[PDB]
């Protein structure tokens, strides 16, 4: 599945996100809900207000998962197991949406890393996110 040098890049990129999980996670979800309104449909129980304790709380859980994805970037399937089961089976999240969250996470990184979000880092992170997205819709049945 993943490459090598890319593993170093995404690890760099991560070290930046790792210290702002709650904010980055919250901003990511807020951007998704704002840009792709249709996604709100999956959170009818949430208060989708930008400063929502819920959004922030979720955002923190999302980025936490990604962090653990980074740590086990070499056996993704066995780590995200519980999450693919939840998203695929329990939630029935349309796979198209994983692309939407992925772009929003990247926008958050570009906004905060500016020039440091280089074509190389962008490319490595884009692979990582697509890989993670694949394992989440791997139980698709």
């Amino acid at each position: 599945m993943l490459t090598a040098e890319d593993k170093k890049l995404i690890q760099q990129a991560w070290e930046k996100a790792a210290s702002h999980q709650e904010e980055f996670g919250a901003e990511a979800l807020t951007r998704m809900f704002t840009t792709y309104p249709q996604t709100k449909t999956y959170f009818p129980h949430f208060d989708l207000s930008p400063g929502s304790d819920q959004v922030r709380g979720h955002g923190k859980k999302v980025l936490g998962a990604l962090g653990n994805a980074v740590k086990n970037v070499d056996n993704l399937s066995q780590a995200m197991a519980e999450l693919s089961n939840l998203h695929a089976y329990n939630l029935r999240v349309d796979p198209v949406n994983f692309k939407l969250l992925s772009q929003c996470i990247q926008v958050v990184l570009a906004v905060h890393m500016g020039k440091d979000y280089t074509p190389e880092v962008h490319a490595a992170f884009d692979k990582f996110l697509s890989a993670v997205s694949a394992v989440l819709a791997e139980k698709y049945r």
């Binding site: 901003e27 807020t30 951007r31 704002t34 840009t35 930008p50 772009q103 990247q106 926008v107 570009a110 906004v111 905060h112 890393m113 500016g114 020039k115 979000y117 074509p119 190389e120 962008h122 490319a123 884009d126």
Partner: protein
């Protein structure tokens, strides 16, 4: 196809601060490096063997500028975009056979470029307005 005052504002305002040449080169460059299969449409550009070669490639840089310049045509014709991109549609579709999925991929990249260049000023509301513009231009090209 319904443009709100807020949206037009967000779009126009930000456009005015865009470095067409620098962002255009970055968008096109990122496209070729993040989605390699797209390089096959740009063989006449020369060296595209590495992100380094692609970033430094004169034609990539000069092409990107042309690409962003047309987006600017959309920015000052938001109500008449379709008509504006008809010809370009023929080119990309008839003459070149560029799959539409690729148009969307470039739009997503452009959004990431604008974000890295305006940081916090690229608000979620701003992103939403641009992502809409991108989607509209992609559809205008896939006619």
């Amino acid at each position: 196809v319904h443009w709100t005052a807020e949206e037009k504002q967000l779009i126009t305002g930000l456009w005015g601060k865009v470095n067409v040449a620098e962002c255009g080169a970055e968008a096109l460059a990122r496209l070729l490096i993040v989605y390699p299969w797209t390089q096959r449409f740009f063989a006449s550009f020369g060296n595209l063997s590495s992100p380094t070669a692609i970033l430094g490639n004169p034609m990539v840089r000069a092409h990107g500028k042309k690409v962003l310049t047309s987006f600017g045509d959309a920015v000052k014709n938001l109500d008449n975009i379709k008509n504006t991109f008809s010809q370009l549609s023929e080119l990309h579709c008839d003459k070149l056979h560029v799959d539409p999925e690729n148009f969307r991929l470039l739009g997503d990249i452009l959004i990431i470029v604008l974000a890295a260049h305006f940081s916090k000023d690229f608000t979620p509301e701003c992103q939403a307005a641009w992502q809409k513009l991108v989607r509209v231009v992609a559809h205008a090209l896939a006619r």
